[PDB]
Each structure stands twice: as C-alpha cells, then as structure tokens.
Design a protein around this ligand. Structure first.
Ligand SMILES: [K+]
Ligand SMILES: [Mg+2]
Ligand SMILES: [Mg+2]
Ligand SMILES: [Mg+2]
Length: 222
RNA sequence: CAUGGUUGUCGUCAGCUCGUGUCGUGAGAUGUUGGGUUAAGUCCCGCAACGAGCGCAACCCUUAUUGUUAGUUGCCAUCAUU
C-alpha cells in the first residue's frame, strides 16, 4: 500500500478533537479544524505489519473472522471476507457468538436444516402458513449467522472495524485470547488490540481500502 | 400442623422458569428489559444475550351456511285418496 492511496481514501481524518483518546496521541500527527490527523507514516508501517501478520496467520491455516457493523464497513467487510473465503459478521454481533459458540451452533444447525427441507421438497408440501413462517425464520438466521454459517471452529484471528463500535466483539476476543487486527480511530483505544491499524473508521473508501489489503493478505497466505 | 389423592383461590391473569453465555467479590443480575403490538411473555423490531420448557394460542366440543351419502320410525314440494 502507498501513503497516497491512504490520503485519497481519507484515512488521515479522525474524529473531533474533544472526542479523541489521549492514548491515540502516539499516532496523531496534528489537529485540523477541531479534528485530529492520523500520522500516515506510522499508518504505512503498521498496515504493512498487519498485512504480514495476516499472511502469517493464513499460512498457519487458522480461521479468520472479519467483523464490521458500521454502515461504512458492513458491505466492505462482507465482500472482502467472502472474497478471502473466510467468515464475516456484518449486521449485528450476537452476544455470546464466540463465548457461547456451542449454543450458536444449534442455530446454525437450524439454518442448515431449514435449507435441507427446501431442497428435499418439504417446503413445497408445507402448508402456506408453515412455509411462510420458516422463510421468515430462515431469513433471520441467514441475516445474523449467515456470514459465519459454515465456520468450522473458533477463529484464530479476528479483524475488526471500529472496535469502539464493536465493543462486545472485542470483549469476546479478549475472553477467548483471539488476536485482533483493528481499524483503530483517534477516539478508539489502542491498548485493546494486538495489531493496530490507525485509520479513519467513518470513510467508506478507507474501510474498503484497509479491508482489501487484509483480504489480499489472507488470500496470499492461502 | 404427619400425608396420598381430590378441590378452593388469585385467574384464564400472562405470567413462572431453566440450559449455555455474560455481568457482579457476593447475594444476585441479564434474557423476561426497551419502541411498537396484542385478549395474551401474542407478535415485530432493538438489545449481551442465544435458545428452550411450563404457560398463551391452535389441535378438541358446540352453535351460525352448505355440498354429497343415506331416506325410516323422519320430511310432503310434485301427485291422487284419508
Ligand atoms: K443464567
Ligand atoms: Mg416476570
Ligand atoms: Mg410465548
Ligand atoms: Mg431484546
């Protein structure tokens, strides 16, 4: 990646000055118009390190989970994670998704079962009311657990967009000792993420750019 | 005021709970809360909760129309007689 790519993506922008985090001054270059400016030089070095770390993790054969519910991030993380073949959560992270992984598997099994009924032909013979209700249920299960529907085990790495937004996701990660590679913003906390990627979380283009670098890293590892 | 069984009661009110997870040092909490909505914890949405069970609802009986099968002990429109 190039610092110019970042600048076009608008990565350098941060949040309002008052809404920053003092711990983020280690990666803040200067403040403009009441807003902070990330240090894109540290950004370039750190994104390189994250690409390297993601490549190493993929080479280990572990499983990667890309998390983002931010409107700027949901579609981007979905596409990039699907492109990498690794699993994603885009709409809403369910409490206990990983800590209660066992229970969530029951819902995933339900989702697979409802699909089998459709393929089997039960849906055709099901009464109008029954089939309609199952479509609604199936839709919700796909809506929530769809992006990880076929995950075999607990992920060995979690990529995150705006951990401050995905507070619960970071908490589950820490509980399970899952290393986190995160898009940390000027208002976010760096101490909670192993591999920090100082970047604007509120730019669609920037989220796509960073997620694309990471998806490329994992694909290259595989 | 040793009990089984049976029964009254709130009340046919929509409540009562558990599994896993999570929070709290702990008793506990969460879900069951909230915006809607319903007769309903009925249901949608959101939510560190995800599910599940007893409930609720439906399955049951009866009444309101009617198709067909049956047509005597029942019915009499078409018919003729009492
Ligand atoms: K519990
Ligand atoms: Mg209650
Ligand atoms: Mg209910
Ligand atoms: Mg809720």
């Amino acid at each position: 990646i190039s610092m110019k790519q970042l600048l076009e993506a608008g990565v350098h922008f941060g949040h309002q000055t008052r809404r920053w985090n003092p711990k983020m001054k280690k990666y803040i270059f200067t403040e403009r118009n009441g807003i902070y400016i990330i240090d894109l030089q540290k950004t370039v070095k750190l994104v390189d390190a994250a690409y390297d770390y993601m490549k190493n993790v993929a080479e280990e054969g572990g499983v990667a989970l890309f998390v983002g519910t931010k409107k700027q991030a949901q579609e981007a993380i979905k596409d990039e994670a699907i492109r990498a073949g690794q699993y994603y959560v885009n709409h809403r992270w369910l409490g206990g998704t990983l800590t209660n992984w066992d229970t969530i598997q029951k819902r995933i099994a339900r989702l697979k079962k409802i699909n089998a009924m459709e393929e089997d032909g039960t849906f055709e013979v099901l009464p109008k009311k029954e089939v309609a209700g199952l479509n609604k249920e199936r839709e919700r299960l796909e809506k929530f657990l769809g992006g990880i529907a076929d995950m075999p085990r607990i992920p060995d790495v979690m990529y995150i967009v705006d951990p401050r937004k995905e507070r619960i996701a970071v908490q589950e990660a820490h509980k399970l000792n899952i290393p986190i590679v995160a898009m940390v913003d000027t208002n976010c906390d760096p101490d909670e993420i192993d591999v920090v990627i100082p970047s604007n979380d509120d730019a669609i283009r920037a989220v796509k750019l960073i997620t694309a670098k990471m998806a490329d890293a994992f694909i290259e590892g595989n």
